Each structure stands twice: as structure tokens, then as C-alpha cells.
Amino acid sequence: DLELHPPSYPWSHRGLLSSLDHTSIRRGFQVYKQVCSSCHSMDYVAYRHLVGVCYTEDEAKALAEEVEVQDGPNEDGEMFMRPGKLSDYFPKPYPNPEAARAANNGALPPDLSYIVRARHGGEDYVFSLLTGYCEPPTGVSLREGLYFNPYFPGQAIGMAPPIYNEVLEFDDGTPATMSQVAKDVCTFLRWAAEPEHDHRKRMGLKMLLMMGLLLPLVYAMKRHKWSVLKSRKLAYRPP
Amino acid sequence: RQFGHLTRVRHVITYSLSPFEQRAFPHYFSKGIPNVLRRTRACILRVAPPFVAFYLVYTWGTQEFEKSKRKNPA
Amino acid sequence: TNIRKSHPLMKIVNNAFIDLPAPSNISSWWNFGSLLGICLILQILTGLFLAMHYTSDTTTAFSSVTHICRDVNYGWIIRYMHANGASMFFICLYMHVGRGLYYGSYTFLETWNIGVILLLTVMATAFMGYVLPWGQMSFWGATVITNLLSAIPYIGTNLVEWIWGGFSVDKATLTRFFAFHFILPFIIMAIAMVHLLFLHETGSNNPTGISSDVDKIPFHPYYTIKDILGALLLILALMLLVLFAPDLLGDPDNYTPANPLNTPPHIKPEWYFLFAYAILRSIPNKLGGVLALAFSILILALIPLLHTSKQRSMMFRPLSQCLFWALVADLLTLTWIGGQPVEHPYITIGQLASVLYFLLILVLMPTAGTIENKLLKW
Amino acid sequence: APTLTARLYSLLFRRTSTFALTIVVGALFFERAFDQGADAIYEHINEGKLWKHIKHKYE
Amino acid sequence: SHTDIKVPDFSDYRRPEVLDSTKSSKESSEARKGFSYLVTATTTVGVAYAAKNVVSQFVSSMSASADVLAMSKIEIKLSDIPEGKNMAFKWRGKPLFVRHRTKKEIDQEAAVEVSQLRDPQHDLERVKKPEWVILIGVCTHLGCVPIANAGDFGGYYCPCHGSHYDASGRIRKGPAPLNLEVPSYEFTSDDMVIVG
Amino acid sequence: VDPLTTVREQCEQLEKCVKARERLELCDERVSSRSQTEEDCTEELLDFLHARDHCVAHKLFNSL
Amino acid sequence: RWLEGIRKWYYNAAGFNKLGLMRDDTIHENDDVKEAIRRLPENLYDDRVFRIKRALDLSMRQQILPKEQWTKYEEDKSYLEPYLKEVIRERKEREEWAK
Ligand code: HEC
Ligand code: HEM
Ligand code: HEM
Ligand SMILES: CCCCCCCCCCCCO[C@@H]1O[C@H](CO)[C@@H](O[C@H]2O[C@H](CO)[C@@H](O)[C@H](O)[C@H]2O)[C@H](O)[C@H]1O
Ligand SMILES: COc1ccc2c(c1)N=C(c1cnn(Cc3ccc(OC(F)(F)F)cc3)c1)C(C)C2=O
Ligand code: FES
Secondary structure (H helix, E strand, O other), X not given: OOOOOOOOOOOOOOOOOOOOOHHHHHHXXXXXXXXXXXXXXXXXXXHHHXXXXXXXXXXXXXXXXXXXXXXXXXXXXXXXXXXXXXXXEOOOOOOOHHHHHHHOOOOOOOOOOOOOOOOOOOHHHHHHHHHOOOOOOOOOOOOOOOEXXXXXXXXXXXXXXXXOOOOOOOOOOOOOOHHHHHXXXXXXXXXXXXOOHHHHHHHHHHHHHHHHHHHHHHHHHHHHHHHHHHHOEEEEOOO | OOXXXXXXXXXXXXXXXXXXXXXXXXXXXXXXXXXXXXXXXXHHHHHHHHHHHHHHXXXXXXXXXXXXXXXXOO | OOOOOOOHHHHHHHHHHHOOEEEOOOOHHHOHHHHHHHHHHXXXXXXXXXXXXXOOOOOOHHHHHHHHHXXXXXXXXXXXXHHHHHHHHHHXXXXXXXXXXXXXXXXXXXXXXXXXXXXXXXHHHHHHHOXXXXXXXXXXXXXXXXXXXXXXXXXXXXXXXXXXXXXXXXXXXXXXXXXXXXXXXXXXXXXXXXHHHHHOOOOOOOOOOOOOOOXXXXXXXXXXXXXXXXXXXXXXXXXHHHHHOOOOOOOHHHHXXXXXXXXXXXXXXOHHHHHHHHHHHHOOOHHHHHHHHHHHHHHHHOHHHHOOXXXXXXXXXXXXXXXXXXXXXXXXXHHHHHOOOOOOOHHHHHHHHHHHHHHHHHHHHHHHXXXXXXXXXX | OOOHHHHHHHHHHOOHHHHHHHHHXXXXXXXXXXXXXXXXXXXXXXXOOOHHHHHHHHO | OHHHOOOOOOOOOEXXXXXXXXXXXXXXXXXXXXXXXXXXXXXXXXXXXXXXXXXXXXXXXXXXXXXXXXXXXXXXXXXXXXXXOEXXXXXXXXEXXXXXXXXXXXXXXXXXXXXXXXXXOOHHHOOOOOOXXXXXXXXXXXXXXXXXXXXXXXXXXXOOOOOEEOOOOOEOOOOOOOOOOOOOEEEOOOOEEEEO | OOHXXXXXXXXXXXXXXXXXHHHHHHHHHHHOOOOOOOOOOHHXXXXXXXXXXXXXXXXXXXXX | OOXXXXXXXXXXXXXXXXXXXOHHHOOOOOHXXXXXXXXXXXXXXXXXXXXXXXXXXXXXXXXXXXXXXXXXXXXXXXXXXXXXXXXXXXXXXXHHHOO
């Protein structure tokens, strides 16, 4: 039970005032859609959330219409299935957690909405996990259905290596290498966990500037009033 | 107790200037830098020694936890 | 013949805020009182706005907190202001107490004891606040900490189940924790006004520890302008966290919902309790550990009785100064050890730090005072 | 040649009423200038990264 | 004597403008106040900008969130409703009736008596497009869901108390006070309608 | 095809990496040589990967 | 005697002398000290008042006197001793009598 902690990759959003790469978010979404969304849920993200971030209103309407979702009841009192809308959330693979366990040999695949924020290391951690799958060292073997990852705690994970070269073609025609696919999906998972990212940092800059102005001004006002006392001379004149 | 009822003082003169007649930052770096060094040198080996000791007990205990979790050559 | 001294309401404002006689020489360490006030108002506002969107039902609770951060307009900036605001509070508190200890302000007995009460109530508030999101650390933290009361002989086990309102931390626990977390800040508000009411009997101590009646200045404008500058610096610290590192002072495990089966690896309270969490784990016996955790805070009530020095402030006292800064460094060590797993050598370091904490307060700093006196022919 | 600070005093700062009207006017002109200026600094720092920059590709 | 007191030298602390003891300070007084009051005035303009932002954000908090705005409007496809028949939807937790009307129903609801109605409204100002009538499917008296293409006046009828609505949605014979509710809407393209 | 496996090789030919690789190969042919001992070689692999993937991080992104 | 070396060192370490204070200026004001102060002659009292005023003004500025102006160890008169000693002697007699 030793530990190998992830290294610090130079993300395009690493700096204090650096925004998320939104074209990387557009790719990363597709990596969730094509690869993850049949195993992992992502409950807090709806189809409307994508508008003005990585897709237009018309694009996100098309993406929503593509998926099945239950709705009801109706005049006769029955639960029907309908095409999705913008107001619908991203659909869960299974109906419940107990169903999910059966499909993955006892393991329950975690919801991905906050996975960047819920793990030590964040996007640095997830990227290392996805690309770090390797063959076990000598003297090592786990029970059938448990793969070797050096970045997972306890050195053994129950997830089959999900990303490889040419896993899915991209909409903008970026060459889909394993490293490229991991980089994009992490950028998306970052935005999933923290949608505020870009606004937060815009506010940060405006705060630093206003403080840069107000702090020396108020400090000058302080010194002004106090100058009566700082300058003063005392004289003791007993008769 | 208000001003006028505080305590008894005799034969003490106080002179002062209006803040509109004077500067907010007189000799700020000139006299300020050396006064700061004086203040820092005065308290340094009261304040600093315990925090040096913390740094040492910290860095000792951290890599002792790492050594212990490694395998022993026997 | 002004209407500042005349009007029944303005009179109280004029005497406690404008024309108050203040020592000429009080340092930056006297700003923390005013800043604690700002923290309290800040928590209440942001808190009230969060309560407009939150629900205390176990199923919807975690979801409501995320709903604030995602769908409510500027709900995220409100939410992280409130969480980092709680940290800024505890920074302000420990600085405020440190000042009292070093400059011997604790001689103002009533003021001091009401302080101890205030501290304890803020602790109680913040403990129940961190439960409200209903994440892993929320649920598992509350479980272990509460369940320590079962270590009381005869009654303890009943007491725990009465606080919970069941056999574990469940639906009834979360709803009542929301009600107590709402009411308590307002009780703090009241106790804080009694705190100041006693302070205005004597007025302020200063860094010298020598009486300042010969050199008082009016609060306005001298200290009103200082307090503005201080407030501005507090806002900078808060906003630097909120806008550049909002998760830095938390724990990741509170981003996954509460699971009564799946235990987090190293369960721990929030940073400002870690010193006392380490003292608890120093003692091997459980009831012993609970009595030590209680005495680690309550010892503040003992401090004025332990005073030996003929001088009030530590300003003119070298030996005491060093022992004080030793006690500070020791507390930093207990906070570190509090965050660590129970193993070699963290066990031994923790034991040694806990012994040193009580040794410094009950034996070393009293002896140091007496040695200092006999060096001055006193 | 009455200095510029002196002009500012006689024309804006002497009557408290004009001092306050100055602050209200100034705050309007400051807000628009500061916001426009600071946003430019941010969007140049993050050139081609934002939805605002990549919008044209899908319209 | 008290004449032995002479005021200490304040040269080190003075502003440059008031250093010369043989010149009158009165020239520089206009300026010296100007500078210091500018600092105060600048500070206030800055604080104004900040406080405006903090306040206005908190006000925004209490206004409708993104998910409430998501259910605000509902889109309906006009080629999906056959001329003559009614079609119902769920909107702000309540039924919503859209009805394509025939040239028979247009002319028959045009020349109705305006005074005889309990709630006097002409048809041309209840709706925009003549071939289309949009209404909330809630009975105005005590809240039911009216059944389409039925009743005496050939429009909507209620089996709760005894109300009869015409093809334009107006009350003709019953206990209901006001006519069926006309929501706020606009046609987008000739094929689509957005209600809300 | 992947920029990743190119860079993993480039970094592997550093003295800190190759010294750690040799350490890995010593217990490779030390656990395998011995029969019936519960001791394995996880530690040595992680030592290697730590040194390798630190370097990989520093310049992998350039090709993305 | 032998510890006079340490007493002289401690005096300067403690450092109230750098503000132009004597030892008895630094004594914490309880009820006995209050009475002792109240019993001082005009001269001794007004001196005490000035010395403290001076120190407080220096403390306000975060400054010290020139080294020439510092209270020398040998020149530190114990001005409050005879008044304070008798104030305490008096109280202990009343406390005894009340038993
Ligand atoms: C067919 C199954 C399957 C696919 C495909 C899959 N996962 Fe998972 N995933 C799992 C299972 C099962 C676990 C739980 C493993 C465990 O706890 O040992 C898991 C765990 C994870 C974890 C948690 C690791 C931790 O620190 O505990 C992350 C992050 C994750 N998956 C992300 C992804 C991403 C990103 C993709 C694709 C781009 C993906 N998964 C594809 C089944 C899958
Ligand atoms: C909600 C928490 C608290 C608030 C709002 C508060 C408020 C204040 C304020 C405004 C002052 C005057 C300004 C100052 O000297 O800082 C003050 C002074 C004081 N407080 Fe607190 N306080 C709080 C907690 C405490 C605690 C926990 C203690 C001690 C355990 C304490 C002890 C004191 C003392 C001794 C003084 C007098 C300081 C002096 O004159 O030198 N207070 N408090
Ligand atoms: C001394 C004052 C207070 C302290 C120290 C305090 C502390 C806290 C803390 C630490 C949290 C958890 C923050 C998080 O991790 O998300 C919290 C949550 C909360 N507090 Fe407070 N609080 C205070 C006052 C108030 C008041 C007055 C209210 C309401 C009137 C309030 C309402 C809430 C609500 C609704 C939450 C849950 C939402 C959230 O998690 O952010 N609090 N509080
Ligand atoms: C270059 C020098 C290298 C330094 C050598 C460091 C490692 C060698 C061991 C040094 C001695 C410390 O050894 C350590 O002591 C502590 C303190 O009692 C023990 O702790 C044990 O006893 C205490 C007694 O109160 C119990 O509370 C605790 O439950 C138990 O674990 C550890 O089990 C032991 O591992
Ligand atoms: C340094 O020495 C002293 C001495 C005496 C006192 C003191 C400091 N600070 C006080 C104090 C209390 N809170 N604050 C900050 C503050 C918080 C909220 C607020 O809201 C309002 F609505 F505008 F009023 C205003 C101010 C300052 C008081 C009472 C006080 O008697
Ligand atoms: S309820 Fe249908 S009309 Fe009265």
C-alpha cells in the first residue's frame, strides 16, 4: 500500500487569469457521450448547460432530441417515453445503483459530475489514471476483473482501460490519440465540476485591480488623519 | 468615563500641525527601512527559533512516514 | 448642545463609537475585534441568502447546495463566500485570543470569560454548518465527534441518541442541525453586545500594558479610518480565496454525497478544530481523550488565575515572549498532526506536542513570570 | 496660473452638494470605462479560448 | 516666563508649498486641499462601483434561477394540429389548449353579440392569428380541466358545476365569472409558436 | 502514432530514469529467481514511473 | 552578588529603559498600587505622568529613544517602594484584625 501521486501537467487553464479552452470542452463532451455515458451517470449537467459554452442553442436541441427519456403520467395514467429537450438532464445508464453493480462485477461506477473536485489531484489525477494503465510488476496478481493502475489507491482498479488510439472520430477532425482523448475529457470534466471557472477568474482580475487602487488610497487617507499625532512634540515644563 | 474626567496631568505642552500643512509620507523609505530592520532584529530570536524547530520536526516526520512504508532488505 | 449626546439612541452610538476615549498607541492586533464583527454580519447575510434556496431533507440536501452553485444567480459566489468566510472568522478569532494572551488583556475578567463563551458558541455553530451540505466528511465527521459523548459513564449512550433523534445521524439530525445553525448566530450577536458592554467599563488595554489615561485619543476619526483600512484588507484575503482558490481550505470528500456504508480514508474535522482533534487522539483511553479535548479549550478560563508576573504585558518580558512563541509553534504542530493518519511517528509527535501544550500553560509560563520578577528585585 | 488641483477644489469640491454630484457623475463614467477596459485585458489574455471567440464557426 | 516657549521646527514634516516662512500660505491653500480631497473623492467613486456590484448580485439571487426559466416557455409545432381539433400540453404545471380554427369557426365567432356575454370581449382582440386560439385549460370558477369539442356552444364544456364555453373560449352559459385565460405569446416562423 | 509513447521513450533515456530502471530489473531477476517468497516489486516500478512521468508532464502538452 | 551579571543583562533585554521608563512605571495597577500612586508627592507623581506619556507616544510611533537618553541600570530609583510597602503592611493588619 505505497502511493504514487500525479505530476502537474501544464493545462491551458492552470494560471491565475487563464480561462478554459472551450474547443477542448466541445471535444471532451463527445468523449463522455461516445465512451463514458453507457457506464457513468452525470446527473447535474443538462442539455441546456452546454449552450453558450461549447454548443449553440440549435446544436444542443439536436443533441437532446437524440436520446430517450421517460415522462408522465398522461390522460389515461401511463408512463411513456419521449424525445429529450433542453430542460432534460443527461440520462443515467441504469435505473439504480444495485443494477449498476451487477453490470460491472460488484463495482459501482461513480457519477462524473464532480469527479475532478471529489479527487485529490483533479484533472492531473484523472489524466494520469486514464493514460497510466500498464502491465503488473513481478510478484503481483489481483482477482479476475481487476486491472493494474499505479495511480489508483491500493494499486488495483476495477475499470477496463477505457481510452485508446482512434476511440472515436472528432467533429473538428483532431487526430484522436490516447493522450489527446484524455486531455480533452479532463478539460470537460473540469467544467462539469466547476462551471463558474471563467466568470470567477474574470472577477478575480477586476478585484485585484480595484484593490490595487483602493488600498493605497485608503492607506493615504489613514496617514493624512494620523499625521497630526505622528508629527507632535511633547514638552515637560515643571516650575 | 468621558473626556474631562479621565486623569490628572500637570505641566505638559503639546505642539502639532494641521494635516493640510504637512505630508502623509515624510521620509518613508529614508527613515522607514532602517526602523523596520531595527524592529525585525529586536524580536527575531524570540519569534523565529520555535518556527525553525517546527520546520525541522515537520520535515523529519514527513519523510520518516515515507521510509517506514518502504520494504526492508530482509 | 448637540443631538448626538441628547437623543437616547444616538447617545449610545456617540459614546461607544465616536467619542469613546481610546489609547493612542494600540497596534494592528486591536483591529481583530472590529473584523470579528464584520465576519459575523457577513456570515448572517450570505447565510440568509443560502437559506432561501436550501432544504434540510436528507434526499434533497446535497442537491440543493449544488442547485445554488449551478442555477441560482451568483449563488456560487454567495456559497463560497460563506464557506471561506467561516475560515476568515476562525483566523480572526485565534489572532484576537493571541493578542489577549500576549498583552495580558485577560485581566479584564468578565470581558474575557464572555469571550470564552463566544468562542465556544462560534465553534458549535461551525460544527453544525459543515454538516448541512450532507457530503462524506459532513456525515462521517458528525458521527465520530457526536459519538464521543457516549464515553460518559451511565448516561452517555442515551445522550448521544437524544441529540441524534434516532439510532444514527439521520433525517431528524439534519433538520434540527439546520434549526440550531440558524438561531445560534443571533444568540452570538447578543452575547457579543454584552462582551462590549463590559469592555466599556474599563476601556482598552494597550501594547505597553501600562495605563493610558494620560494619552487618550477620540475613536473618530483616528480608529474609524483604521478600521476601514482593516476591513478592506479582510475583504482582500476573503476574495483571494473565493476567486482564486475556493477549495483550498476544504477537503475533496465533501463533493461526493453521504454514504452510510462507504467510509472515507482519513476522516477529520475542518482545519480550525485539528489542534484539539490531535489532543483527543493523544490519550489512548476514550473518556480520558474526551476530557482532554474539553480541557484543551476550557483552560482559557484558567489563564487569569495562572498569572504571576508583576508586569501585565509580555512587552518587557523576554523569557515569557519565547515561551509564548513556543506555544504558538506547538499549536501549529498539533494542527499538522491532527491532519495525519494514526501511525509512526505521528503518534509519538502528537503525544509529545500535547504534553508540551499543557506543560507550557500550567507550569512553564507561570515559572517564567516568577523568574522574571526575581530578576527585577520584585 | 492657479494649479489644476486648485481648479478642481474651487469648481467641484468646495460646496458639499457639488462634491456629491461629482462623485455620482464620476462613478458612471468610471464604471463603463473600468468594465470595458478590464474585459479587454481578460479576453486578450485568453485569446481564442472563449465561446465569444469561437462563436463565428457555428453561425 | 512663558515667553521662553518657542514653537519647535516642523520643516521635516511640512509640505514643500509651505516651507518658505517669508511667503503667505494662502496661495497654496487652494491647491493643498484640492489634492487631499481628490484622494477622498476618488476612493468614494471606487467604493460606489464595488458596492453597486455586491448589492446587485444579491438582488439577482432572489430572481428566477436558470431551471425556472427553463420551464418558462413551451414550443408547439403548428403543422401537428389538424384544423378543427384541439391539442393539449403541460405548461407551468397546468394544461394548455392550442386550437386551429376553421373559416366556419372564425366567421361564427366574429358576429356574436358582445353585450349578451358575461365578460364582454370581441374575438379579434382575444388573439393575433385568426386561424389560431391559445388558452389555459383551467376552468375559472373553481378549477377543472374542460373537455374539447363538446357542450351547448360547441367549444369547451365542464362536468364540475355547469359551464359552457364557445369556440373563442368565452363564457356563454354557466357559473364561471371570467373567460378562459389568454396567455402571452408570439409566432416565430410560420410553422412554430412559442408560448411564454 | 501517439505523441505520448514517443515522449515516454525520450524521457526514459535520462540518467535518473535509467538508474531507476536498473533497480527495477535487479528485483525482476531476484523475485523470479527465488521460489516461494511473498515479496514483490511494486515499489521499484513506482520509483521509475515517478521519475519518468515527471519529465513526460514537462513537454507532452506541446504536441496537443 | 553573583547573579548581578544576569540582572544587568535581563534589564536591557526587557528594554523598558529604551522608552525612558523606570521599573516602577511598568508595575501592573491593582488596588494597592492605585493607593500607592495616590500617596505620591507632587514632584514624583508628575514625573511618572510624563515618563508614561513619553513612552506611550514612542509606542505609538514604533520607535525608541537615542541610546544616550536610555534609563541606566544603576540610575533606576525604586521610587514607589516605601509607599507601596506600607499600603500592603496596612492591609495585612486589617485582614489580621478581621480574624
Ligand atoms: C465498461 C465500464 C467502464 C467504462 C467504459 C469506463 N468506466 Fe470509469 N469506472 C468504471 C468502474 C467499474 C469504476 C470503479 C473502479 C473501482 O472502484 O475499482 C470506474 C471508476 C472511474 C473513476 C474513479 C477513479 C477513482 O479515483 O476512484 C474515474 C475518474 C472514471 N471511472 C472515469 C472514466 C472516464 C473519463 C471514462 C472514459 C472516457 C471511463 N471512466 C470509462 C467503469 C467504466
Ligand atoms: C464573536 C467573537 C468576538 C467578537 C465579535 C469580539 C468583539 C470584540 C471587540 C469589537 C473588541 C474591542 C476591539 C479589540 O480590542 O479587538 C473586543 C475586545 C476584547 N475581546 Fe473580544 N470578541 C470576540 C471574541 C473574543 C474571545 C474569544 C475572547 C477571548 C477568549 C475575547 C476577549 C476580548 C478581550 C480580552 C478584549 C479586550 C482587548 C483589549 O482591550 O486589549 N473576545 N472584542
Ligand atoms: C457564526 C456564523 C456562521 C458560521 C460560522 C457558519 C458556518 C457554516 C459553514 C462552515 C457551513 C458549511 C459551508 C460549506 O461547506 O458549504 C455553513 C453552511 C450553511 N450555513 Fe452557515 N454559518 C454561520 C451563520 C449562518 C446563518 C446566520 C445562516 C442562515 C440564516 C446560515 C446558513 C447556512 C446554510 C443554509 C448553509 C448550507 C449551504 C452551504 O453549504 O453553503 N449560516 N455555515
Ligand atoms: C537516525 C535515527 C532514526 C530514528 C529511529 C526511529 C524509528 C525507531 C523507533 C524509535 C522509538 C519510537 O517508537 C515508537 O514509540 C511510540 C511511543 O510510545 C510507540 O507508540 C506505542 O506506545 C504508545 C504508548 O503511550 C501508545 O500510545 C501507542 O498506541 C503505541 O503505538 C510506537 O509503537 C513506536 O514505534
Ligand atoms: C479597537 O478598539 C475598539 C474599541 C471599541 C469598539 C471597537 C473597537 N469596535 C467595535 C466594532 C464592532 N463592530 N465593528 C465593525 C462593524 C461591523 C458591522 C457594522 O455594521 C453597521 F451596521 F454598519 F453598524 C459596523 C461596524 C467595530 C465596537 C462596537 C466598539 O465599541
Ligand atoms: S368548477 Fe367548472 S365552472 Fe364551477
